[PDB]
Nucleic acid binder design. Structure first.
Lengths: 386, 65, 136
RNA sequence: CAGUCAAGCGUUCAUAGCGACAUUGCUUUUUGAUUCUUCGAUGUCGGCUCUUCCUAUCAUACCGAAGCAGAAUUCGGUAAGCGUUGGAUUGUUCACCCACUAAUAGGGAACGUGAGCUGGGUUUAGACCGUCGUGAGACAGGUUAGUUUUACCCUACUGAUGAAUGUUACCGCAAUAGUAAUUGAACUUAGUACGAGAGGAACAGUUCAUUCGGAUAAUUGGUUUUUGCGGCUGUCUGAUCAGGCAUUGCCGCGAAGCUACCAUCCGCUGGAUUAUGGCUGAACGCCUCUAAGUCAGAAUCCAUGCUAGAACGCGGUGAUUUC
RNA sequence: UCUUAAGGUAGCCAAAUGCCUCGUCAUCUAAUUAGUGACGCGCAUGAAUGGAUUAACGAGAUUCCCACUGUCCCUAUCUAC
RNA sequence: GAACAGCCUCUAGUUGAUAGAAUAAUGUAGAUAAGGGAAGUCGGCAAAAUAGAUCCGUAACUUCGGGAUAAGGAUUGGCU
């Protein structure tokens, strides 16, 4: 017999299986289509999710009730110290997909990135890329020839980079190393761009510009085993039900004599690789200057970390990025910022955003002051002050 | 952007933070947070709550500004 | 809601589901309005049609003038009492939820409004804004 | 439920829409007919919950026809991608109103779904009534009260480990499988086209909203064993200070975490096509969208994108154990 | 007048008794197969197989209202085991 | 305290219920929830609300005994 009353199915079937992601760092499944007219540029960056704040901006859109009016928006602050380029890999296209031809690396590898290749680094001889560096120190004994191979073949070249998490305030000390595709010029231009950038750092101000809709790729916050009621949002069973009410009542008809793949079941919630799109860049801030949170309307000497530090993260002494809204993953998590795979207009991507005031009150409670100067100016003299 | 004042605690209300309450007499009361809002709604006197700006002013403590 | 809509309204937290008695804030003679439907409301299984500030509901008068009782008339919500946030960023509420009787066109049956009137309702219905005393 | 014929209705006019007398079918969502299976038992109405499927399409996309001027509508095609509600009365399926709505289409899945629930009804035993019976008792007549058991096994499903291709580590590829967005209103076009008037559009452009989905906790709200701070009662520690106990003693506030369309953010652009409208053009010296060839074209399909990554699919790269 | 003697009187009623039936009218609701008040050729009410009424009482059955609420919109969080 | 109520103590008696670690889902037993307030459901089932004492006020109906704590209001500590 048919469903007595229609209702949409609970949950998106296109996000299955709701299992734990294979790694804490989410990879970029797809990179932007390459051009040749455009110059060689990285198409992604790696940063760390620090926390969220609030901003006030003078919204302008011709036809809304809030035209030329102040709006309060949640923003996510991503701590993004410059990533170090160490290596490049060429991919040749084959009738079975892209296949990696070879990976050329850099003469000297930082101990932070070299720590990635170990699971017990302290109790090791640190023998890592030693023979590779021995192959180095000569002109092209095994380096220029491999780069020539990558130029002659390998329709796709991706630069291997790693994060500067000694600069980041985490307890990690193990650099996240990933691949960023280069999407400009020819293969020769991409390869010698990588070679020239070997052992060198690149900052976000080169990759991402202000007022840019980028994509965020991250592993969402994990929550362990969850029941169907919170994992899929199915309706709670009535109060008077033997054997529990946080269940799905009927998990299938008699025939087919199996539980279908589309019935809601309990299992792992969260910790999934997700790529969300169209997140606007609100500010590309630099740590190598004070007054990160100073706007042309505030003009107050003030960094971006709130009073008491970002909760569970700390300080943003590096470069950083203000993404509007929320992004997948929790704080302290490595996120990947990616260029958009299409050029949207929407009268929303080409909206010129200029912040008026960004909140730095303490997120560790109901914060009242933005600066300790403001706190002192309000309270006055305290007994702790002599 | 202009900053509001708590109608109970006299605190500095920055945008988005706090709450607004409109009485039947159309008297707008702005609260910095749930503490001030709840103490107001249980009809407590700011003049008699020790940490409020009104109490501070009434007991003359910290008037050098 | 629908043809007689002067402008658009941002989403406001739904605080007045079907079955809510809200005060009557006009001089039409009704004392309260019983919400029985919400104009423009969506359709979901086991989900009550709920109202917010400034949208037209279809209501009945349970207390008030006999000639206003026992019939079904359009009404408009002018105070919500369920705290909603504006794009400004502030969360505000009134101490009671109240509405006024109107015809389907948006013309108010009563002649005056007692108490404050929400800005969104005022901007949607100029007649309510005209007869209202204070708009917040 | 659908055809065929066409007396006739339709101001004239069989087929715009319909169509009598007849006749051909399909369906198994009615109910019969049967008695093949089950009486060393297949839990037996409805509702709730949830998934999927069908199309005989209610709405949404694009179209053809009209007794289509416009608006509204009616008939039909490709179409099941996407949705199809909130309530009063009833145990009810079915009904029937009140409304919202773009719409409130019809169905299947052991008349889906009771080791999922409930137990209102039916259909044990108690009891009342009416009629029937001399009586015990009967009554798809009414009424009231009436125990709803077991999963730890196998499989399926949801998640989670994992032996073994020298070892170990890092970065990847992508077969295959899944896939997702949806609908409305307002401004403007425009009081314009159209129309004697009454009335009254649409494409493009903006602003929101509905349903759905995936995240997130800046803010607001919720939660309080932070037993964090304060207050309070009774008692106990000789009094004070500090505390114990009252199964978290109670109250106010309460960070953090978790979390709410109760809060915020985000939800892509290319190609092939279906109907259908055409080009050239025979068949058939004329014609003809079709026969050869071909142009456009739908919420369709396949890609782009998104999810997993084959634990017997794979690549590249680092290190590779000697007194 | 006939049948078996009498032919349903006071009352009461779609009642725990009415098939038709979700009876008809009024009221209660936005909407009522529910409730109440009426009506009564009443399948098949009715006088100690007791009729009608009835204050008080009731872990009896039913309807509405006020209060209250996570029953629900629509879920979330916390504690012990 | 009205109280061989509940709650805390004295004398007396026990400290006996397989334990350790962790804090997932679903449970069992307790709770709390913005706005609405029965829209849930066969049905307000379950829960909440009320609650002691003093003072005030108390309707229909009635077998004059009741109904009645009807309904409905206010107060409540400490100290001198």
């Amino acid at each position: 017999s048919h469903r007595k009353y229609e209702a949409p199915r609970h949950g998106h079937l296109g996000f299955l299986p709701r299992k734990r992601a294979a790694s804490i760092r989410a990879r970029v499944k797809a990179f932007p289509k390459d051009d040749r007219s455009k110059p060689v540029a990285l198409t992604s960056f790696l940063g760390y999710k620090a926390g969220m704040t609030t901003i006030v901006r003078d919204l302008d859109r011709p036809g809304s009730k809030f035209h030329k009016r102040e709006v309060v928006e949640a923003v996510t602050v991503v701590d993004t110290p410059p990533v170090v380029v160490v290596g490049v890999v060429g991919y040749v296209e084959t009738p079975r997909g892209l296949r990696s031809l070879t990976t050329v690396w850099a003469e000297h590898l930082s101990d932070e990135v070299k720590r990635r290749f170990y699971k017990n680094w302290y109790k090791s001889k640190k023998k890592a890329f030693t023979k590779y560096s021995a192959k180095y120190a000569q002109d092209g004994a095994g380096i220029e020839r491999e780069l020539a191979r990558i130029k002659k073949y390998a329709s796709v070249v991706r630069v291997l980079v790693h994060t500067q998490i000694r600069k980041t305030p985490l307890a990690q000390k193990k650099a996240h190393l990933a691949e960023i595709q280069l999407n400009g010029g020819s293969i020769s231009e991409k390869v010698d761009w990588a070679r020239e950038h070997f052992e060198k750092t690149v900052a976000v101000d080169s990759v991402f510009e202000q007022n840019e809709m980028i994509d965020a790729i991250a592993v969402t916050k994990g929550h362990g085993f969850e029941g169907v009621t919170h994992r899929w949002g199915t309706k709670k069973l009535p109060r008077k039900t033997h054997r529990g009410l946080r269940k799905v009542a009927c998990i299938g008809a008699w025939h087919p004599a199996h539980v279908m793949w589309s019935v809601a079941r309990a299992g792992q919630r969260g910790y999934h690789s997700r790529t969300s799109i169209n997140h606007k860049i609100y500010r590309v801030g630099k740590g190598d200057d004070e007054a990160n949170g100073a706007t042309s309307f505030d003009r107050t000497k003030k960094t971006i970390t709130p009073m008491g530090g970002f909760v569970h993260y700390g300080e943003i002494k590096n470069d950083f990025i203000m993404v509007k809204g929320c992004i997948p993953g929790n704080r302290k998590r490595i996120v990947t910022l990616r260029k958009s795979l299409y050029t949207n207009t929407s009268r929303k991507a080409l909206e010129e955003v200029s912040l008026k005031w960004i909140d730095t009150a303490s997120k560790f409670g109901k914060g009242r002051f933005q600066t300790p100067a403001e706190k002192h100016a309000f309270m006055g003299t305290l007994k702790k002050d002599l | 952007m202009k900053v509001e004042i708590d109608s109970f605690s006299g605190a500095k209300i920055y945008p988005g933070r706090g709450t607004l309450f409109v009485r039947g007499d159309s008297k707008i009361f702005r609260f910095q947070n749930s503490k001030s809002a709840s103490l107001f709604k249980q009809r407590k006197n700011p003049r008699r709550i020790a940490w409020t700006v009104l109490f501070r002013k009434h007991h003359k403590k910290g008037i050098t500004e | 809601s629908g043809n007689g809509a002067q402008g658009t309204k941002f989403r406001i937290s739904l605080g007045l589901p079907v079955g809510a008695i809200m005060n009557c804030a006009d001089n039409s003679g009704a004392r309260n309005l019983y919400i029985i439907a919400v104009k423009g409301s969506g359709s979901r299984l086991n989900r009550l049609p709920a109202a917010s500030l400034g949208d037209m509901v279809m209501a009945t008068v349970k207390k008030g003038k006999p000639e206003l009782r026992k019939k079904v008339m359009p009404a408009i919500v002018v105070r919500q009492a369920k705290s909603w946030r504006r794009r400004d960023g502030v969360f505000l509420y009134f101490e009671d939820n109240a509405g006024v009787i109107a015809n389907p066109k948006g013309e108010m049956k009563g002649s005056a409004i007692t108490g404050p009137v929400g800005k969104e309702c005022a901007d949607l219905w100029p007649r309510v804004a005209s007869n209202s005393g204070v708009v917040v």
